[PDB]
Amino acid sequence: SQIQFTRHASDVLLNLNRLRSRDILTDVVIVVSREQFRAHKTVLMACSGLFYSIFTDQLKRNLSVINLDPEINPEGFNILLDFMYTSRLNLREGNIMAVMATAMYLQMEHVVDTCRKFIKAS
Amino acid sequence: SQIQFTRHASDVLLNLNRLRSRDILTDVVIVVSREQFRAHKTVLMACSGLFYSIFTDQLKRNLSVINLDPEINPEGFNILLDFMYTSRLNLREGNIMAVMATAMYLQMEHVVDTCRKFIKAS
Numbered sequence: 418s419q420i421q422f423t424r425h426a427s428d429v430l431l432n433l434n435r436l437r438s439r440d441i442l443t444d445v446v447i448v449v450s451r452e453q454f455r456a457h458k459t460v461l462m463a464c465s466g467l468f469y470s471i472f473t474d475q476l477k478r479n480l481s482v483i484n485l486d487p488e489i490n491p492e493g494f495n496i497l498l499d500f501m502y503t504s505r506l507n508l509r510e511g512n513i514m515a516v517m518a519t520a521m522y523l524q525m526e527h528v529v530d531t532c533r534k535f536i537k538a539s
Numbered sequence: 540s541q542i543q544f545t546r547h548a549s550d551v552l553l554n555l556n557r558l559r560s561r562d563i564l565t566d567v568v569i570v571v572s573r574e575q576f577r578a579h580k581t582v583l584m585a586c587s588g589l590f591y592s593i594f595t596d597q598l599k600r601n602l603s604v605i606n607l608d609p610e611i612n613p614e615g616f617n618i619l620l621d622f623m624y625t626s627r628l629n630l631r632e633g634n635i636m637a638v639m640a641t642a643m644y645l646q647m648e649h650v651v652d653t654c655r656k657f658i659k660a661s
């Protein structure tokens with residue numbers, strides 16, 4: 418029935434990423450060892466079972482700082498956060514294992530499955 | 540270079556819409572005459588020049604209630620808000636003029652242009 422705008426979802430995500438680049442309406446800092454990364458909780462929830470579980474919980478929804486497991490690699494996390502905001506996943510032989518283990522921790526099954534495909538094709 | 544996830548932007552927007560349906564992390568009420576509609580400021584900014592201009596402004600960024608022009612038709616606004624969260628625009632002969640005038644007010648040029656195409660094809 419309704420008219421479908423094929424580029425609209427991509428346009429929305431690009432503009433969310435532009436807001437993240439300007440720190441506009443970002444509402445959380447994710448701390449990963451010595452690094453930290455600002456984001457929108459809504460985008461994190463949309464992209465991660467871990468962040469969904471954290472922020473749906475009424476005890477945690479209002480947190481402004483989330484400390485990740487100190488074993489998580491900041492580069493693997495940064496790669497996945499950039500994927501969340503762009504639809505683009507930079508998998509390479511040098512980062513595949515860190516990215517895949519981080520995607521398991523963040524509960525991102527389709528990314529984990531793509532990492533398995535990458536390993537199988539290598 | 541990077542791996543492109545074709546469904547990712549659509550997945551993000553669907554999950555933002557699911558959060559809006561549960562009123563999770565919505566941060567504004569838009570008042571349109573006797574009706575009101577909750578939303579995420581980030582999605583409104585991504586989809587509307589009017590909301591972009593309102594919430595980028597440091598005097599207005601923290602507002603939790605925005606009163607629209609009392610001449611705006613609530614049904615036309617609801618149609619456009621649903622489009623923002625779905626990529627689907629329900630244009631019909633009975634609503635085209637209200638939708639098009641509302642899209643002008645919200646500063647949504649590609650929607651206005653699609654409304655002109657609808658008129659031309661009618």
Ligand SMILES: Cn1cc(C#CCn2cnc3c(c(/C=C/S(N)(=O)=O)cn3CC(=O)Nc3ccncc3Cl)c2=O)cn1
Pocket residue numbers: 462463464465466467469520521522523524525526527528529554555557558
């Ligand atoms: C150890 N291990 C665990 C897993 C897993 C898992 C399941 N699992 C749960 N949750 C997910 C995802 C994705 C995938 C993204 S991706 N990048 O893979 O395509 C996003 N989310 C959040 C989500 O569904 N959010 C909402 C749902 C309904 N309503 C509102 C919202 Cl916000 C997701 O895989 C993988 N390994």
Ligand SMILES: Cn1cc(C#CCn2cnc3c(c(/C=C/S(N)(=O)=O)cn3CC(=O)Nc3ccncc3Cl)c2=O)cn1
Pocket residue numbers: 432433435436584585586587588589591642643644645646647648649650651
């Ligand atoms: C009287 N009259 C005025 C107009 C107009 C206009 C221009 N105009 C300005 N702004 C827009 C749009 C759209 C279109 C959406 S749509 N539905 O038409 O495709 C979205 N936005 C917001 C936006 O660009 N936001 C960001 C930009 C950069 N960085 C971060 C963000 Cl959040 C947009 O058309 C039409 N009639």
Ligand SMILES: [Cl-]
Pocket residue numbers: 440441442443600
């Ligand atoms: Cl802000």
Ligand SMILES: [Cl-]
Pocket residue numbers: 478562563564565
């Ligand atoms: Cl909330």
